[PDB]
Write a protein that binds this ligand. Structure first.
Ligand SMILES: CNc1ccc(-c2ccc(C)c(N3CC(=O)NS3(=O)=O)c2)cc1
Ligand SMILES: [Cl-]
Ligand SMILES: [Cl-]
Ligand SMILES: [Cl-]
Ligand SMILES: [Mg+2]
Length: 300
Protein backbone atom coordinates (compact mmCIF):
# COMPACT_ATOMS: atom_id res chain seq x y z
CA UNK A 1 0.00 0.00 0.00
CA UNK A 2 0.90 3.69 0.13
CA UNK A 3 -0.35 6.16 2.72
CA UNK A 4 -1.89 9.43 1.53
CA UNK A 5 0.75 11.30 3.56
CA UNK A 6 3.42 9.35 1.67
CA UNK A 7 1.98 10.45 -1.67
CA UNK A 8 1.81 14.04 -0.47
CA UNK A 9 5.40 13.83 0.79
CA UNK A 10 6.65 12.64 -2.60
CA UNK A 11 4.79 15.41 -4.48
CA UNK A 12 6.20 18.11 -2.18
CA UNK A 13 9.76 16.75 -2.38
CA UNK A 14 9.47 16.49 -6.16
CA UNK A 15 8.29 20.05 -6.68
CA UNK A 16 10.76 21.24 -4.04
CA UNK A 17 8.13 23.19 -2.15
CA UNK A 18 8.71 22.56 1.56
CA UNK A 19 9.43 26.26 2.14
CA UNK A 20 6.14 27.31 0.52
CA UNK A 21 4.10 24.69 2.37
CA UNK A 22 5.71 25.68 5.67
CA UNK A 23 5.31 29.44 5.11
CA UNK A 24 1.63 28.94 4.34
CA UNK A 25 1.24 27.23 7.71
CA UNK A 26 2.93 30.25 9.32
CA UNK A 27 0.54 32.60 7.52
CA UNK A 28 -2.53 30.62 8.57
CA UNK A 29 -1.38 30.14 12.18
CA UNK A 30 -3.53 31.46 15.04
CA UNK A 31 -2.83 34.86 16.59
CA UNK A 32 -4.04 35.23 20.19
CA UNK A 33 -3.09 37.79 22.85
CA UNK A 34 -0.16 37.25 25.22
CA UNK A 35 -0.90 40.18 27.50
CA UNK A 36 0.18 38.51 30.74
CA UNK A 37 3.51 37.41 29.22
CA UNK A 38 4.16 41.03 28.23
CA UNK A 39 3.52 42.61 31.64
CA UNK A 40 6.59 44.47 32.93
CA UNK A 41 6.77 42.27 36.03
CA UNK A 42 7.17 39.22 33.80
CA UNK A 43 9.98 40.54 31.60
CA UNK A 44 12.63 38.49 33.41
CA UNK A 45 10.54 35.30 33.26
CA UNK A 46 10.78 35.15 29.46
CA UNK A 47 13.87 33.73 27.73
CA UNK A 48 12.96 35.25 24.35
CA UNK A 49 11.21 38.58 23.85
CA UNK A 50 9.20 37.20 20.93
CA UNK A 51 8.24 33.77 22.25
CA UNK A 52 5.22 34.03 24.57
CA UNK A 53 2.38 31.78 25.71
CA UNK A 54 -1.09 32.83 24.62
CA UNK A 55 -3.20 33.98 27.56
CA UNK A 56 -5.97 31.43 26.92
CA UNK A 57 -3.70 28.39 27.06
CA UNK A 58 -0.97 29.51 29.46
CA UNK A 59 -0.15 27.39 32.51
CA UNK A 60 -0.91 29.24 35.73
CA UNK A 61 1.25 28.66 38.79
CA UNK A 62 -0.82 28.21 41.96
CA UNK A 63 0.61 31.16 43.90
CA UNK A 64 -1.27 34.39 44.64
CA UNK A 65 2.00 36.30 44.18
CA UNK A 66 2.72 35.94 40.47
CA UNK A 67 1.15 33.05 38.60
CA UNK A 68 3.18 33.48 35.39
CA UNK A 69 5.38 30.96 33.66
CA UNK A 70 6.30 30.77 29.99
CA UNK A 71 4.48 27.51 29.36
CA UNK A 72 1.46 26.43 27.31
CA UNK A 73 -1.06 23.60 27.64
CA UNK A 74 -1.35 22.00 24.20
CA UNK A 75 -4.67 20.18 24.57
CA UNK A 76 -5.31 17.89 21.60
CA UNK A 77 -9.00 17.09 21.90
CA UNK A 78 -9.39 14.61 19.04
CA UNK A 79 -6.18 12.74 19.94
CA UNK A 80 -7.04 12.90 23.67
CA UNK A 81 -3.51 13.71 24.69
CA UNK A 82 -2.15 16.85 26.32
CA UNK A 83 1.38 18.30 26.43
CA UNK A 84 2.82 21.24 28.30
CA UNK A 85 5.31 23.09 26.14
CA UNK A 86 7.67 25.48 27.86
CA UNK A 87 10.94 27.36 27.41
CA UNK A 88 14.16 26.07 28.94
CA UNK A 89 13.86 27.49 32.47
CA UNK A 90 15.94 30.52 33.40
CA UNK A 91 18.16 30.77 36.51
CA UNK A 92 15.25 32.53 38.27
CA UNK A 93 12.43 30.27 37.03
CA UNK A 94 13.70 26.78 37.91
CA UNK A 95 11.59 26.85 41.07
CA UNK A 96 8.56 27.84 38.95
CA UNK A 97 9.28 25.07 36.47
CA UNK A 98 9.35 22.36 39.13
CA UNK A 99 6.35 23.98 40.78
CA UNK A 100 4.49 23.59 37.50
CA UNK A 101 5.56 19.93 37.24
CA UNK A 102 4.21 19.40 40.72
CA UNK A 103 0.88 21.20 40.41
CA UNK A 104 0.16 19.72 36.98
CA UNK A 105 1.04 16.18 38.20
CA UNK A 106 3.40 15.53 35.30
CA UNK A 107 5.35 12.27 35.45
CA UNK A 108 7.73 12.97 32.59
CA UNK A 109 9.90 15.83 31.41
CA UNK A 110 11.21 15.78 27.84
CA UNK A 111 14.27 17.92 27.10
CA UNK A 112 15.26 18.32 23.47
CA UNK A 113 18.20 20.70 23.82
CA UNK A 114 21.53 20.97 25.64
CA UNK A 115 22.26 23.53 28.35
CA UNK A 116 24.94 25.04 26.16
CA UNK A 117 24.37 25.32 22.43
CA UNK A 118 26.43 27.39 20.02
CA UNK A 119 28.53 28.91 22.79
CA UNK A 120 25.47 30.21 24.63
CA UNK A 121 23.31 29.17 27.59
CA UNK A 122 20.00 28.01 26.10
CA UNK A 123 18.70 26.49 29.34
CA UNK A 124 19.54 26.75 33.04
CA UNK A 125 20.97 23.68 34.77
CA UNK A 126 17.63 22.95 36.43
CA UNK A 127 18.24 19.34 37.62
CA UNK A 128 21.03 17.89 39.80
CA UNK A 129 23.93 16.21 38.01
CA UNK A 130 25.17 14.28 41.05
CA UNK A 131 23.15 12.17 43.50
CA UNK A 132 24.84 13.68 46.55
CA UNK A 133 24.14 17.29 45.45
CA UNK A 134 20.37 17.67 45.56
CA UNK A 135 18.65 20.97 44.67
CA UNK A 136 16.38 22.92 47.01
CA UNK A 137 14.10 25.49 45.37
CA UNK A 138 13.49 27.87 48.25
CA UNK A 139 11.03 30.11 46.46
CA UNK A 140 8.61 27.22 45.72
CA UNK A 141 9.53 24.89 48.61
CA UNK A 142 10.58 21.91 46.50
CA UNK A 143 13.45 19.45 46.78
CA UNK A 144 14.91 17.66 43.75
CA UNK A 145 17.25 14.66 43.87
CA UNK A 146 18.98 12.68 41.16
CA UNK A 147 18.15 9.02 41.80
CA UNK A 148 19.89 7.41 38.82
CA UNK A 149 20.57 7.92 35.14
CA UNK A 150 20.99 5.78 32.05
CA UNK A 151 23.27 7.43 29.53
CA UNK A 152 23.07 6.31 25.89
CA UNK A 153 25.08 7.60 22.91
CA UNK A 154 22.65 10.38 22.02
CA UNK A 155 20.11 10.58 24.86
CA UNK A 156 19.98 10.17 28.63
CA UNK A 157 17.13 8.98 30.85
CA UNK A 158 17.10 10.11 34.47
CA UNK A 159 15.06 9.17 37.52
CA UNK A 160 14.47 12.18 39.73
CA UNK A 161 12.69 12.48 43.06
CA UNK A 162 10.62 15.64 43.47
CA UNK A 163 9.53 16.44 47.01
CA UNK A 164 7.00 19.01 48.13
CA UNK A 165 8.72 20.22 51.29
CA UNK A 166 5.39 21.55 52.58
CA UNK A 167 3.64 18.18 52.70
CA UNK A 168 6.72 15.92 52.47
CA UNK A 169 4.99 14.11 49.61
CA UNK A 170 7.45 12.77 47.03
CA UNK A 171 7.11 11.82 43.36
CA UNK A 172 9.25 10.05 40.79
CA UNK A 173 9.86 12.22 37.74
CA UNK A 174 11.39 10.74 34.58
CA UNK A 175 13.71 13.00 32.56
CA UNK A 176 14.19 12.14 28.88
CA UNK A 177 17.06 14.16 27.54
CA UNK A 178 17.75 14.20 23.80
CA UNK A 179 21.32 15.50 23.63
CA UNK A 180 22.08 15.56 19.89
CA UNK A 181 19.26 17.58 18.32
CA UNK A 182 20.68 20.89 17.01
CA UNK A 183 18.63 24.07 17.40
CA UNK A 184 16.84 24.84 14.12
CA UNK A 185 17.95 21.36 13.07
CA UNK A 186 16.59 17.83 12.79
CA UNK A 187 17.40 14.52 14.46
CA UNK A 188 20.05 12.35 12.81
CA UNK A 189 17.36 10.07 11.38
CA UNK A 190 13.72 9.10 11.82
CA UNK A 191 15.09 6.00 13.56
CA UNK A 192 16.96 7.93 16.27
CA UNK A 193 14.00 10.19 16.83
CA UNK A 194 11.45 7.38 16.99
CA UNK A 195 13.66 5.23 19.23
CA UNK A 196 13.68 8.16 21.67
CA UNK A 197 9.94 8.91 21.35
CA UNK A 198 9.09 5.29 21.98
CA UNK A 199 11.34 5.34 25.03
CA UNK A 200 9.18 8.19 26.35
CA UNK A 201 6.02 6.28 25.43
CA UNK A 202 7.13 3.03 27.03
CA UNK A 203 7.73 4.70 30.41
CA UNK A 204 4.04 5.40 30.89
CA UNK A 205 4.75 9.15 31.07
CA UNK A 206 2.16 9.95 28.37
CA UNK A 207 -0.65 8.04 30.10
CA UNK A 208 -3.88 10.01 30.63
CA UNK A 209 -3.71 8.85 34.27
CA UNK A 210 -0.86 11.35 34.67
CA UNK A 211 -0.71 15.09 34.16
CA UNK A 212 0.55 16.31 30.75
CA UNK A 213 4.18 15.49 29.94
CA UNK A 214 6.34 18.62 30.05
CA UNK A 215 8.23 19.19 26.79
CA UNK A 216 10.87 21.86 26.27
CA UNK A 217 13.83 22.86 24.19
CA UNK A 218 15.25 26.37 24.46
CA UNK A 219 12.27 28.39 23.22
CA UNK A 220 9.83 25.49 23.61
CA UNK A 221 8.50 25.73 20.05
CA UNK A 222 10.92 24.32 17.40
CA UNK A 223 12.19 20.90 18.44
CA UNK A 224 9.38 20.76 21.03
CA UNK A 225 6.76 21.31 18.34
CA UNK A 226 8.36 18.65 16.18
CA UNK A 227 8.29 16.09 19.01
CA UNK A 228 4.64 16.74 19.82
CA UNK A 229 3.42 16.87 16.22
CA UNK A 230 4.97 13.45 15.51
CA UNK A 231 3.57 11.90 18.67
CA UNK A 232 0.07 13.28 18.18
CA UNK A 233 -0.07 12.19 14.54
CA UNK A 234 1.06 8.68 15.47
CA UNK A 235 -1.55 8.61 18.25
CA UNK A 236 -4.36 9.75 15.94
CA UNK A 237 -3.35 7.09 13.45
CA UNK A 238 -3.26 4.61 16.31
CA UNK A 239 -6.76 5.37 17.65
CA UNK A 240 -8.32 4.84 14.26
CA UNK A 241 -5.79 2.26 12.98
CA UNK A 242 -6.04 4.33 9.79
CA UNK A 243 -3.01 6.30 8.62
CA UNK A 244 -4.87 8.02 5.81
CA UNK A 245 -7.18 9.78 8.28
CA UNK A 246 -4.25 11.87 9.54
CA UNK A 247 -3.70 15.37 8.11
CA UNK A 248 -0.31 16.44 9.47
CA UNK A 249 -0.56 20.11 8.41
CA UNK A 250 -4.03 20.32 9.93
CA UNK A 251 -2.77 18.78 13.18
CA UNK A 252 0.09 21.30 13.27
CA UNK A 253 -2.33 24.19 12.75
CA UNK A 254 -4.50 22.84 15.57
CA UNK A 255 -1.44 22.68 17.88
CA UNK A 256 -0.56 26.28 16.96
CA UNK A 257 -3.89 27.38 18.42
CA UNK A 258 -2.31 26.66 21.85
CA UNK A 259 1.25 27.98 21.41
CA UNK A 260 2.91 30.09 18.71
CA UNK A 261 5.71 29.09 16.35
CA UNK A 262 5.48 25.33 16.81
CA UNK A 263 7.99 23.87 14.29
CA UNK A 264 10.58 26.46 13.36
CA UNK A 265 11.91 25.42 9.91
CA UNK A 266 10.63 23.78 6.73
CA UNK A 267 13.02 20.88 7.27
CA UNK A 268 11.63 20.21 10.73
CA UNK A 269 8.21 20.01 9.07
CA UNK A 270 9.67 17.69 6.44
CA UNK A 271 11.28 15.61 9.19
CA UNK A 272 7.93 15.40 11.00
CA UNK A 273 6.47 13.76 7.91
CA UNK A 274 9.38 11.31 7.78
CA UNK A 275 8.97 10.37 11.45
CA UNK A 276 5.22 9.86 11.16
CA UNK A 277 5.48 7.87 7.92
CA UNK A 278 8.16 5.60 9.40
CA UNK A 279 6.40 5.30 12.77
CA UNK A 280 3.23 4.23 10.98
CA UNK A 281 4.96 0.88 10.36
CA UNK A 282 4.90 0.09 14.08
CA UNK A 283 1.38 1.48 14.62
CA UNK A 284 -0.06 -0.73 11.89
CA UNK A 285 1.48 -3.92 13.32
CA UNK A 286 5.10 -4.28 12.19
CA UNK A 287 6.29 -4.88 15.74
CA UNK A 288 9.86 -5.77 14.68
CA UNK A 289 10.54 -2.25 13.35
CA UNK A 290 11.14 -0.99 16.92
CA UNK A 291 14.27 -3.16 17.17
CA UNK A 292 15.46 -1.91 13.78
CA UNK A 293 15.21 1.70 15.05
CA UNK A 294 17.14 0.76 18.17
CA UNK A 295 19.95 -0.73 16.08
CA UNK A 296 19.94 2.09 13.51
CA UNK A 297 20.04 4.75 16.24
CA UNK A 298 23.29 3.30 17.63
CA UNK A 299 22.28 4.17 21.20
CA UNK A 300 25.22 2.08 22.48
C1 LIG B 1 9.03 34.09 16.79
N1 LIG B 1 10.40 34.44 16.94
C2 LIG B 1 11.38 33.54 17.46
C3 LIG B 1 11.50 32.27 16.92
C4 LIG B 1 12.45 31.40 17.41
C5 LIG B 1 13.29 31.77 18.44
C6 LIG B 1 14.31 30.75 18.90
C7 LIG B 1 15.52 31.15 19.44
C8 LIG B 1 16.44 30.18 19.81
C9 LIG B 1 16.15 28.82 19.65
C10 LIG B 1 17.19 27.81 20.08
C11 LIG B 1 14.93 28.42 19.10
N2 LIG B 1 14.57 27.05 18.88
C12 LIG B 1 14.78 26.31 17.41
C13 LIG B 1 14.55 24.98 17.54
O1 LIG B 1 14.70 24.16 16.68
N3 LIG B 1 14.06 24.69 18.95
S1 LIG B 1 13.99 26.15 19.77
O2 LIG B 1 14.70 26.08 21.04
O3 LIG B 1 12.60 26.43 19.99
C14 LIG B 1 14.02 29.40 18.72
C15 LIG B 1 13.20 33.04 18.98
C16 LIG B 1 12.24 33.93 18.49
CL1 LIG C 1 23.06 19.57 28.63
CL1 LIG D 1 28.91 25.18 22.09
CL1 LIG E 1 19.83 30.06 31.31
MG1 LIG F 1 28.89 10.31 41.63
Amino acid sequence: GHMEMEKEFEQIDKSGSWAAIYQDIRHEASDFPCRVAKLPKNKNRNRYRDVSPFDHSRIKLHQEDNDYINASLIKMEEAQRSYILTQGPLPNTCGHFWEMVWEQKSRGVVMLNRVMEKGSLKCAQYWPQKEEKEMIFEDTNLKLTLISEDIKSYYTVRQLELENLTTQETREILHFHYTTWPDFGVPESPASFLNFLFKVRESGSLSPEHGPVVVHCSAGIGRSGTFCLADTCLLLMDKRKDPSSVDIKKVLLEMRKFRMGLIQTADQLRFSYLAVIEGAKFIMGDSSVQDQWKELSHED
